[PDB]
């Protein structure tokens, strides 16, 4: 069952992790912490939402002797993969040089920016050796201004249309002093052919803001397999969606119009009413229970049998049993 406790409608219905709101940097468990560090990163495990802000300062990666905190292992930034919401801001002034993008925040979806850095910024990425932002799932920056600056070899960030992610008027953007626009196109670091003129977070097809044609999975392709293909499919909300295994692959034309085994064009084995099946019902029940048997005629359409023939049948009438 599924019900609501403390403002969240939660149970083990959940796909993936159950939603869990955690505190930001400077409040609560993280009081007096200047940044995400090696001792407090544990307390973000399995968090999906963050009430408040998130700082990743350089202090984090060199350690600190005054507070006896060791430096942070770059590998332990994957703790942040489950986070999908930040009510405050996201400020990054330090990131491992080993790592080329912010793929620890790949599943981040929304920055509410109810509290803003200084007085204006909800997203702040400054002074990193990253080559691409990599915020693939970022769909809304609700209040603050965006500053991405000083990232000497960062590309792609200018392709993004930042007004299509905003939520309030007066919301500006400061993209400044990253890698050169001409230098990015010259090195081949430009949005993939399959992206649309909205931008991208990186080079690969799964990094587009949106797709020019269609999407299969979270990847972003050209054609959906409508007329040809191995697991050919149909298009629903600009998305390739598989076609029920029990519908015969029809050549030259579309093979179905919906997900179910009913709304395809021709069945691959037999038919029971609206649905295409592989086996006519032989011992299915309902209520006022009686086991209903069904025989397939010469044209492989299943019809039910004379009710009194309860131990199976092959022919119609009384003759089968």
């Amino acid at each position, epitope marked *: 069952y599924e019900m609501e406790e403390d403002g969240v409608r939660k149970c083990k219905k959940c796909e993936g992790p159950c939603r869990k709101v955690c505190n930001g940097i400077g409040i609560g468990e993280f009081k007096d912490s200047l940044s995400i560090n090696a001792t407090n990163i544990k307390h973000f495990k399995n968090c999906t939402s963050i009430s408040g802000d998130l700082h990743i300062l350089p202090v984090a990666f060199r350690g600190d002797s005054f507070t006896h905190t060791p430096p942070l292992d770059p590998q332990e930034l994957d703790i942040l993969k489950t986070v999908k919401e930040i009510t405050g801001f996201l400020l990054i002034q330090a990131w491992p040089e080993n790592r080329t993008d912010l793929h620890a925040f790949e599943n981040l979806e929304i920055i509410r920016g109810r509290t803003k850095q200084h007085g204006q910024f909800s997203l702040a990425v400054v002074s990193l050796n990253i080559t691409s932002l990599g915020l693939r799932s970022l769909k809304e920056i609700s209040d603050g201004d965006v500053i991405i600056s000083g990232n000497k070899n960062l590309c792609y960030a200018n392709t993004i249309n930042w007004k299509k992610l905003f939520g309030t008027s007066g919301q500006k953007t400061k993209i400044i002093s990253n890698r050169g626009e001409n230098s990015c196109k010259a090195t081949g670091q430009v949005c993939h052919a399959l992206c649309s003129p909205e931008g991208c977070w990186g080079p690969e097809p799964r990094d587009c803001v949106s797709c020019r044609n269609v999407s299969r999975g979270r990847e972003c392709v050209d054609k959906c397999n409508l007329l040809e293909g191995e697991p050919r499919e149909f298009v*629903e909300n600009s998305e390739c969606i598989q076609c029920h295994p029990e519908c015969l692959p029809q050549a030259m034309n579309i093979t179905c119009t919906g997900r179910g085994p009913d709304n395809c064009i021709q069945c691959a084995h037999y038919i029971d009413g609206p649905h295409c099946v592989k086996t006519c019902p032989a011992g299915v029940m309902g209520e006022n229970n009686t086991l209903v048997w069904k025989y397939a005629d010469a044209g492989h359409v299943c019809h039910l049998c004379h009710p009194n023939c309860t131990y199976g049948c092959t022919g119609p009438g009384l003759e089968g049993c």
Partner: nanobody
Amino acid sequence: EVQLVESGGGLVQPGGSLRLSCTASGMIFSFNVMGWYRQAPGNQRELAATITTDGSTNYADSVKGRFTISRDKNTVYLQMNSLKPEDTAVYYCHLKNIRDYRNYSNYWGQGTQVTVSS
């Protein structure tokens, strides 16, 4: 080929009841299934209840126990009892003219709006 004319629909209050009816005139074949599909805001269209000439019925799991599909010749009736907000949708009459397992055709009505609401 085949046309379908629908009657019924309307709004009710939660827990109330409605009757839907659809009668089909045309080139109708001997083995065929008739019934209703439905689409709520803003989901996909899904089967609600389809009875066949053979009598055997199919229901969505959401509606079993509350919906009753019945057939006389080439007109079908749907008794919708114990109606819930989730049932608010457009209901499409339907007919699947079945010749063979590789040969059938689908016809749809215009769509009747059912809402439930206080």
